[PDB]
Ligand binder design. Structure first.
Ligand SMILES: CO[C@H]1C[C@@H]2CC[C@@H](C)[C@@](O)(O2)C(=O)C(=O)N2CCCC[C@H]2C(=O)O[C@H]([C@H](C)C[C@@H]2CC[C@@H](O)[C@H](OC)C2)CC(=O)[C@H](C)/C=C(\C)[C@@H](O)[C@@H](OC)C(=O)[C@H](C)C[C@H](C)/C=C/C=C/C=C/1C
Length: 107
C-alpha cells in the first residue's frame, strides 16, 4: 500500500504514538510527473494527529513507521491514496502518489 525508501535516517528509536501530533515537511507529486503541493516552498510545516483518519492511509502509515528526523520517499498506491474517485481537480482516478516526507518533531 505504501512503500518507504529512506532519504535521510532518523534516530531509529523515536516513533509516533497513537494520538500524537506529527509535524512534517512534505512535497507531493504524481508518480513520474507533476508536483501538486509542497510545505517546504511555503516554509510552513504540516501538522496532523495520528489515529484520527486526518490524512490519506499511505501518509498516515508512512509517517507511523518513521523515527524523528527521518526523511523518506513514500510511494503510495491508489487504494492507500484517493482511489478510483481521485481528488477533485488535482488528483486523477487511480493515481500512484509520491511524497517526500520529513518527520520534524512529535508533539
Ligand atoms: C489547502 O491545502 C489543503 C490540503 C491539500 C488538499 C489537496 C491535496 C492534493 C494536498 O495538496 O493537500 C496534498 O498534498 C495531499 O494530498 N495531502 C496533504 C498532506 C497530507 C496528505 C494528503 C492528505 O491526506 O490531504 C487531506 C485530503 C485531501 C482529505 C482527507 C484524506 C483522508 C480522509 O480520511 C479524510 O476524510 C475525512 C479527508 C487533506 C488534509 O490533510 C486536511 C488537513 C484534513 C482534512 C480535510 C480532514 O482530515 C478533516 O476531517 C474532517 C479534518 O480533520 C480537518 C483537519 C478539518 C479542517 C476544518 C480542514 C482543514 C483542511 C485543510 C486543507 C489543506 C491544508
Amino acid at each position: 500500500g505504501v512503500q518507504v525508501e529512506t532519504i535521510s535516517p532518523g534516530d531509529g528509536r523515536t516513533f509516533p504514538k497513537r494520538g500524537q501530533t506529527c509535524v512534517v515537511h512534505y512535497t507531493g507529486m504524481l508518480e513520474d510527473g507533476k508536483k501538486f503541493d509542497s510545505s517546504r516552498d511555503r516554509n510552513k510545516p504540516f501538522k496532523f494527529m495520528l489515529g484520527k483518519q486526518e490524512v490519506i492511509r499511505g501518509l498516515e502509515e508512512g509517517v507511523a513507521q518513521m523515527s524523528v528526523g527521518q526523511r523518506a520517499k513514500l510511494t503510495i498506491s491508489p487504494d492507500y491514496a484517493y482511489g478510483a474517485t481521485g481528488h477533485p481537480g488535482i488528483i486523477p482516478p487511480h493515481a500512484t502518489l509520491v511524497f517526500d516526507v520529513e518527520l520534524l518533531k512529535l508533539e
